[PDB]
Structures are given as C-alpha cells and as structure tokens.
Amino acid sequence: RNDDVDQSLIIAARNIVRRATVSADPLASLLEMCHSTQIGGIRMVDILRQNPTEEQAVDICKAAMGLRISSSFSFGGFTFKRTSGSSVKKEEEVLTGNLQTLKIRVHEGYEEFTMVGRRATAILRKATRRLIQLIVSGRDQQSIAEAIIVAMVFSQEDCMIKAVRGDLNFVNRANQRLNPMHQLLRHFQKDAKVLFQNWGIEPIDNVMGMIGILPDMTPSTEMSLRGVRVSKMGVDEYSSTERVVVSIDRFLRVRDQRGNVLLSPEEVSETQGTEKLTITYSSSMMWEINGPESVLVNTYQWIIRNWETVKIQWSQDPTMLYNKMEFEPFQSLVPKAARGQYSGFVRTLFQQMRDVLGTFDTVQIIKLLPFAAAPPKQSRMQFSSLTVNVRGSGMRILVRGNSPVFNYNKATKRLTVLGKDAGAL
Ligand SMILES: CN1CN([C@@H]2O[C@H](COP(=O)(O)OP(=O)(O)OP(=O)(O)O)[C@@H](O)[C@H]2O)c2nc(N)[nH]c(=O)c21
Known part of the structure; x- marks a missing residue:
C-alpha cells in the first residue's frame, strides 16, 4: 500500500x-x-x-x-456509516423560512451513525426529524462547526428548515439544480448564524472529556447547542x-x-x-486542466501528431473533421460572439483551397482548422486577426503570417505556441 x-x-x-x-x-x-x-x-x-x-x-x-x-454513503463531505437501527422513507413537502416548498424523503426511525471527515469526526444519534445526540471532535472550532452543520441538516429538523433565509437555487457545474438536501447543505455551509441561533441551547453536566460549543463557535464548560457535545479526545473513526x-x-x-x-x-x-x-x-477533455495556454499547445500538438489522418479527412469528408470532439477545448476559448463568425470565414478559405486546387498551404490549415469546428454562419471575411481569449487578455492570431500565439519558423520546421514547443513537420 x-x-x-x-x-x-x-x-x-x-x-x-x-x-x-x-x-x-x-x-x-x-x-x-x-x-x-x-x-x-x-x-x-x-x-x-x-x-x-x-x-x-x-x-x-x-x-x-x-x-x-x-x-457507506457521503453527505456534506462526511462518510456516514450506519452502526445501528433503521429507517423507512416517506416523501413529504416542507416549507422553508422563505416559503419555498421542498420535496424530501423524511426518514422515519431511530438510527446511529459515525460521520468521518478529513478534519472532524462524530457519532450521530437521530430519530424522525430529530437530532438526539451529536458527539463531535475536530482540529479546530471551524472544523467542528462544519460537522455540526451537516448533522443539523441531515437531521431534517423543523427548526433547521425554518432557519432558511432567502431562496435556494444552487446549481452544479452543468447548471443543474442540486437536490433539496444539498440546497440546504450549501445554504447553511455559506452561513449558519440563523441556524445556530434558532437551534436551542442547554446546560451541560461537566463530564470529563465532553465540553460544549455555543452559536458563536466558542467552547463552553457550562452549556452547549441542544444535543451537541465536543469530545476532547478524538472520536473513534475506525471500522x-x-x-x-x-x-x-x-x-x-x-x-x-x-x-x-x-x-x-x-x-x-x-x-x-x-x-x-x-x-x-x-483525453482531449483534460487539456483545460493546465489552463487556457496548454489548451492551445495541446490542440496544435494533436493536429500535427495525427496530420496524415487529418489530411485524408480534410479533402474527402470535411464535416466529420469539423465535428471532432478534440476542437471543443479550442472553441471554448473563442469569444461567444464570434464562434459562428470565424467558422464561416475559415470554412470558405478551405473551400477556395479545394476549388482553386493550387493554393494548398498546410501551415494555414493547421493554424486555422480549430476555428471551423463551430456551426457556420455567413461571413464578411478579410479578417486581420482572429481573437482567442486566454486568462483575461484576448490574444489574437493573424490570418497571414505569424503571431505571439502561433509562431511557425519555416527554416526550423517546428511550431512554437506561447513560448513552448508544439510538434514539428
Ligand atoms: C436524511 N437522510 C439522507 N440519507 C441518505 O443520504 C443519501 C443522500 O441523500 P440525498 O442527497 O437527500 O439523496 P436522496 O436520493 O434524495 O435521498 P433519499 O434516500 O432520502 O431519497 C441517501 O442515500 C439517503 O438515503 C439518510 N439515510 C439514513 N439512513 N437516515 C437518514 O435520515 C437519511
């Protein structure tokens, strides 16, 4: 291992x-x-x-x-292992403190869990829409608080639902709505002041090991959030x-x-x-991981590696070449106003190249083929340059001749892209 x-x-x-x-x-x-x-x-x-x-x-x-x-399952970034009891699901509508309806499966029954996170661990005991006990330990007060928040949401308690302020419209990277329990998670993870304020406080017995935590996340030997105790010794996370x-x-x-x-x-x-x-x-889907700069390097690299394949496809079946998934990383860097605009201008420049027969450039094709991936619109043409948005700045590639983004040395026969090398022919 x-x-x-x-x-x-x-x-x-x-x-x-x-x-x-x-x-x-x-x-x-x-x-x-x-x-x-x-x-x-x-x-x-x-x-x-x-x-x-x-x-x-x-x-x-x-x-x-x-x-x-x-x-085990994951909830709020904590691994939940059920150590006792069971539940059944009843689908219900609940009203948030913004009067937003949420359709949830209320879990009915008594259950015990361990919750394991990177910076905190806890034992959770819980019944139907009720947190009975939470024994929690962690690196600092903020890490303890993260676990408290998740357990409060997981409990499905009424006072947690009513503590919601404002509307819940959190979405993932694909712009899809998070499910209701994750709506609640993200909301209270952003700000738990109202949650902790309305949850309730109780006096605690001064037990050795266990102490309290208040709404402001400071420790206390005298009182604590209802049902919540902080173990000084780390909670047993093994199973x-x-x-x-x-x-x-x-x-x-x-x-x-x-x-x-x-x-x-x-x-x-x-x-x-x-x-x-x-x-x-x-995979071409991962060229983005090292930034917008490496997407350009990789896009041109991929064209030069598979050039004998692309050269056969370019003459015969051009629509298959334009609809490759490998040009989509490049198309994301092209401004959204000019995606279909350059796709016409460049696709017509290849149409003149096939029709006239003796205008085959090679360097011009590799340099511009990524622009032809989008759905084509009609073009004014005679573009001085074609803009491609890097980190903030919009660095442009010239149609004829070299540029800072695309620098082909004809003597060397090696392509440079923003300083770094990108294959050769
Ligand atoms: C509140 N929850 C949530 N939960 C589990 O946590 C996981 C994620 O819950 P979720 O994000 O609400 O997904 P969803 O499919 O709506 O869950 P559910 O199974 O409640 O319909 C699911 O496997 C769900 O069963 C629970 N599991 C147990 N045993 N007891 C509980 O009280 C709860």
Whole structure:
C-alpha cells in the first residue's frame, strides 16, 4: 500500500469526475478519461482494480467500471456509516423560512451513525426529524462547526428548515439544480448564524472529556447547542471496509442494491492537491486542466501528431473533421460572439483551397482548422486577426503570417505556441 499512489489516484479521480459532470453523457465521458489516464506510468483502470482506497471520486470511478465500493454513503463531505437501527422513507413537502416548498424523503426511525471527515469526526444519534445526540471532535472550532452543520441538516429538523433565509437555487457545474438536501447543505455551509441561533441551547453536566460549543463557535464548560457535545479526545473513526455491488447512472449517481444514493459529484471535494506521482491524461477533455495556454499547445500538438489522418479527412469528408470532439477545448476559448463568425470565414478559405486546387498551404490549415469546428454562419471575411481569449487578455492570431500565439519558423520546421514547443513537420 503506497501513499503516493493513493494520493495521486484521488487527485486524478476528482479532476475526471469534475470534468465529466459538464459533459452531455457524464458516465461515458468518465470512462473514456479513466481508460486514457495513467498514474505513475500505470493505467488508471489497473490501479482502480487493485487499490482499496475509499474516497468519493475514486469510488465513483470504481462504480463506473462495475467494481465494488464501501457500503457507506457521503453527505456534506462526511462518510456516514450506519452502526445501528433503521429507517423507512416517506416523501413529504416542507416549507422553508422563505416559503419555498421542498420535496424530501423524511426518514422515519431511530438510527446511529459515525460521520468521518478529513478534519472532524462524530457519532450521530437521530430519530424522525430529530437530532438526539451529536458527539463531535475536530482540529479546530471551524472544523467542528462544519460537522455540526451537516448533522443539523441531515437531521431534517423543523427548526433547521425554518432557519432558511432567502431562496435556494444552487446549481452544479452543468447548471443543474442540486437536490433539496444539498440546497440546504450549501445554504447553511455559506452561513449558519440563523441556524445556530434558532437551534436551542442547554446546560451541560461537566463530564470529563465532553465540553460544549455555543452559536458563536466558542467552547463552553457550562452549556452547549441542544444535543451537541465536543469530545476532547478524538472520536473513534475506525471500522472494517464492507464492499458491495453498486449501480451508477448517466449523471454519476451511485446507488446500493436497495436503491439508496451512496455518492454523486455533489459529494466530491473541491480541494485540489499537488500530485506526488505523475498523472498523464491523454483525453482531449483534460487539456483545460493546465489552463487556457496548454489548451492551445495541446490542440496544435494533436493536429500535427495525427496530420496524415487529418489530411485524408480534410479533402474527402470535411464535416466529420469539423465535428471532432478534440476542437471543443479550442472553441471554448473563442469569444461567444464570434464562434459562428470565424467558422464561416475559415470554412470558405478551405473551400477556395479545394476549388482553386493550387493554393494548398498546410501551415494555414493547421493554424486555422480549430476555428471551423463551430456551426457556420455567413461571413464578411478579410479578417486581420482572429481573437482567442486566454486568462483575461484576448490574444489574437493573424490570418497571414505569424503571431505571439502561433509562431511557425519555416527554416526550423517546428511550431512554437506561447513560448513552448508544439510538434514539428
Ligand atoms: C436524511 N437522510 C439522507 N440519507 C441518505 O443520504 C443519501 C443522500 O441523500 P440525498 O442527497 O437527500 O439523496 P436522496 O436520493 O434524495 O435521498 P433519499 O434516500 O432520502 O431519497 C441517501 O442515500 C439517503 O438515503 C439518510 N439515510 C439514513 N439512513 N437516515 C437518514 O435520515 C437519511
């Protein structure tokens, strides 16, 4: 068991899951990236089949491949393992303190859980829309507070629902609505003042180990939030991993065999580590990961590598070449006002090249072929340059001759892109 492999697998899995959510078919995209990614020179799919690491993004990728994962679920970034009791679901409408209706499954029954996070751990005891007890420990008061918030929302208590202020319209990267329980999570994670204010306070017995925490997140030996105790000693976070068969849908929601959602992209951490082992993504969907600059380098690199393939497709079947998925990373950098505008001008420049027969440039085709990917509109033509938006600044590529973005030295026969090299012919 290597820590560097585990750490790097998690980073690779998160990046792929985040990118996959924006796709039209997130599951198929995620599998494509998993099969075209290597970590420490080993294929990611081989690592996933051999690695026991349980983490949300990793387990989403494992699920995609039909592998077993932990039976536990993720909620608010905490791993929830049910240690006792059970519940049944009753679908209900509840009114927030903004009078927004939320359709939720109220869980009926008594249950006990451990909650395991990176900076905090807790035992949660709970009944129908009621938090009975929360024993929590963590690195600092802010980390304890994160766990408190999640448990309050998970409880589904009335006073939590009524503590909502303003409207809940949180969305993911694909502009899809978060589900109601995640609407509540994101809301109170942003600001828990009203939640903690309305929750209630109680006096506590001065027990050895246990202390209180107040609405302002400061500790107290005298009183605490209702049901909440802070363990000075860290709460026991160990258990044996029980792996089970799971299913997964188009949008990367992973379910156990009872149909309960264990994981989704909403449960994947936003934190970005620096990998200890080299991760190499070969998919074009991942060219964005190193910024807008590497997307240009990679786009032109890919054209030069597969030029004998592109040169055959360019003459015969041009519509198949324009509708490649490899030019979509380039098209995102092109300003939205001029995507169909340049797609006409450049597609007509290739039409004159085929019709006149003796105007085949090669350097002009590779330089401009990414602009022809969008749906074409009519063109005024005679453009001095074509703008491509990098980090804030809109650096432009000239039609004839070189530029800062595209610098082809004719003597060297090597293409440079924003300083860095990008293949050769
Ligand atoms: C409030 N919850 C939420 N929950 C589980 O947490 C996971 C994520 O909940 P969610 O984001 O509301 O998804 P959803 O599909 O709506 O969950 P549900 O199963 O409640 O319909 C699900 O597996 C859900 O069953 C719970 N599981 C148990 N055992 N007891 C509970 O009180 C609750």
